[PDB]
Symmetry: C3
Subunit: 273 residues, 3 copies
Amino acid sequence: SYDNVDTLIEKGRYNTKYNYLKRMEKYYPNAMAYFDKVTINPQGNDFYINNPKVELDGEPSMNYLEDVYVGKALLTNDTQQEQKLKSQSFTCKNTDTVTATTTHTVGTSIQATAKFTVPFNETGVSLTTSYSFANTNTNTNSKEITHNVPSQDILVPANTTVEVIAYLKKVNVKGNVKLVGQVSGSEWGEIPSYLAFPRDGYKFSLSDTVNKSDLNEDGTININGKGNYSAVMGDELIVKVRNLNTNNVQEYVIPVDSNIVKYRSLSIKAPGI
Amino acid sequence: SYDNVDTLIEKGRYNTKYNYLKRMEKYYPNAMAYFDKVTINPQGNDFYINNPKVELDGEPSMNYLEDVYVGKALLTNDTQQEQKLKSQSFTCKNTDTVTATTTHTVGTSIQATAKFTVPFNETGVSLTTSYSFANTNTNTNSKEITHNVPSQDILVPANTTVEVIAYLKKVNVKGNVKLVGQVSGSEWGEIPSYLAFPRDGYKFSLSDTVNKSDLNEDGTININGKGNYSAVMGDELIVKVRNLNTNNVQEYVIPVDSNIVKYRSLSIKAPGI
Amino acid sequence: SYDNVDTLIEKGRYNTKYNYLKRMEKYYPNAMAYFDKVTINPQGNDFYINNPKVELDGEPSMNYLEDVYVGKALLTNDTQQEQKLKSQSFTCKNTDTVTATTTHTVGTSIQATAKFTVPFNETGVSLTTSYSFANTNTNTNSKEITHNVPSQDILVPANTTVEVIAYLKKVNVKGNVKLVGQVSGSEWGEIPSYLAFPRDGYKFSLSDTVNKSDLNEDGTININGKGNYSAVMGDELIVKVRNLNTNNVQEYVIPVDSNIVKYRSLSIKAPGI
Ligand SMILES: [U]
Ligand SMILES: [U]
Ligand SMILES: [U]
Ligand SMILES: [U]
Ligand SMILES: [U]
Ligand SMILES: [U]
Ligand SMILES: [U]
Ligand SMILES: [U]
Ligand SMILES: [U]
């Protein structure tokens, strides 16, 4: 259980080149001193990260960022009794975005990717990016959403005008992910024959660079990288209605009903009932 | 109907210099090849953009940005009945600003300007800048506003203290303008006499660089540039009162009544009536 | 009363070097002309700023910046009568920070510091930094706060589900400080003997570089520097409950009860009572 730079672990080439000169120490006593005059030429691998998944390192933090104005309406009840009065429908085209960086890669050597869906729906519109395990990429996805607020029925007391403001709250969800998976496989190369020294075909596994305890059953080895994200997305649609005689304001959420969000038609009471 | 770089269109000097060498093709067959050995020297113009107006390319977007704290008050009713209790008056000096850039000029050659008033009043205080049609200028205007909230009468139930918070909502209105107008007039210059070549006084209109269809009646030609803006301005003044026994909060807008905004004196009910 | 660069005032070395050559004008008429061939070597001081205090140059400005989501809860009353229903407790670890710069030092020469506590408590958690009088330092202090919201009792009408959102308002308090205090003391040095010129041990006070009127009783002299700040801190904890039949939302402040803020357990009415 546990490991973070595939690249540092692949320096178990160091093992092949050392043990190599160690045999040669019998044939010539100054063997170790030739450490860098002897080149070691990689020629391939089947290195692979299995079941790459991104997951939440910590809980997400959420801030209510801004409110988007969506619409306005005066509704006028010049009657001696209370009336149901209909507001107009609105359309807001608003964009939900997320941007996602890899902060600590998992080594550079082996490529991998994994989708991550933003842990905040609240509208019916999900949002996904991905992370690259092996370089520090900033990827950015997004989605235009059209919120269709239909007419609302608003009870308005007698001799009251009423101001109706509608707005879409936005929320900014930030957090830290960990990139994880189970690395397998081997490299094969050659320590080419130098002067008196013999050629040496090699093949090391990554299993054999750590410890049989750290290693799993199935033979792979766990890796972790780091990554952050920051998304901005719609939350509730609010309708605030204000009675222009008393100036009291009452607040209402208009609930939800591709990339088109339709909202319920509600009947709601203005302050003064 | 339609055109965007006066400057590209003024390269109907190219027309005068070409047609010029075209006549000379009879007298000498290698005329076109002297295209850049022959200089063309402008000497004046009465180019002019008529009725320059800025106008809204798209609807404005509005975000409720921040709330400015304006004041606080505890109001205490240690009586066995409900009392009208007066809050203190406040003054807030707050600044409404707008900044405005030209994003795609209309060509560099001819100067023009046009005022633009920010499409959001909501306080009694308007805000205007302008755009330069011919260079990418950022201009910034602003206005200090002093909001004078008088004493408010607050009904407070028996044996209730009440906390009153007042604040000014700010709103951030951003959008895209288009700079428009009707260009007229001409340039006059000279293709000075070179070696065997004769001098050639010229005068071309801008009308004669496009197409009689695109041209208007009156003879001018329509132009468009681009421009954005971003203003931050006051919207409603809110008074929130909280009943300290139940902790319910009720919300109220205090309506409006040079660069001094006076607000109404309202009578309002604390939660608990 | 009044003074702002100790450093400009210490150029009453200029006084010692001038008056010095003024005596020499008798012995040789071209004395003033040697002004910079004569070196003046400081060797010490007991300069000191007494009772250094930071204080508020203007009132603070406060913006409600963002709301931190703290928790969510559905509470369901599938009974034919009204029920008290308990929400779950939450923990929010949130950080209150302040950053503070010195904008106009008070001269570079003499060191001093003074603590400044942020003029906004509202949680039970104060916040302090300091200012350096003599260089333009940005210092930043902060405090993790854990807000412990216990279970709340929420009256919920019959056949009503109810959504409960809890959030912590943050506020951004910015303003300008003035760094003040009463400077005392002296420098002593030497105008070393050059060619025909005699050595001259000196000791000037700072008192004797301005005017006996500006000077105080006790002999010191008032100084002022400038400095700004910007803190971000928690204000009220809000619980908003929404009745899912009518969609009305009522709002509530949950009042406060080291770096651990415990909150009251309230009994509150959902909309619909
Ligand atoms: U995991
Ligand atoms: U919700
Ligand atoms: U509100
Ligand atoms: U237009
Ligand atoms: U309004
Ligand atoms: U509120
Ligand atoms: U003072
Ligand atoms: U408060
Ligand atoms: U609210």
